[PDB]
Design a protein around this ligand. Sequence first.
Ligand SMILES: O=C(O)c1cc(/N=N/c2ccc(S(=O)(=O)Nc3ccccn3)cc2)ccc1O
Length: 125
Amino acid sequence: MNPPPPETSNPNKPKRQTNQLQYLLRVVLKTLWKHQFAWPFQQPVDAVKLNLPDYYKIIKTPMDMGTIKKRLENNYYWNAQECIQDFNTMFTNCYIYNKPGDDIVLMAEALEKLFLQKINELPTE
Ligand SMILES: O=C(O)c1cc(/N=N/c2ccc(S(=O)(=O)Nc3ccccn3)cc2)ccc1O
């Protein structure tokens, strides 16, 4: 059985808009979402649909780009680092659950390399 997805909104959290958060949504998330390998990462891992009955026994901090998109859009993140950490969690979850050399690991590695290229150009101020 799948867990509920990660929280994406909280009416009590303070909100702010920074140039880095705007770039994370309008550039970073947008670019990764369109990538040829993005589709397995566009929504929470559905262990029932995918027949992965051990997924949530191994992965205790699930994360995905659909969740990250919602967090950015809802102003859930206060610090750009929170969003960067969620992307890192997504990539590392793939490396944890799978094994070196698996196709899905190669795909995650390619998305991670593109992610690092884009966050290298995070704006200042
Ligand atoms: O949930 C998903 O959508 C999901 C998708 C997965 N896709 N695996 C794939 C998807 C595509 C390919 S591929 O046809 O493009 N071949 C490839 C791709 C990269 C490197 C080497 N070979 C190879 C494996 C693997 C696990 C998953 O859970």
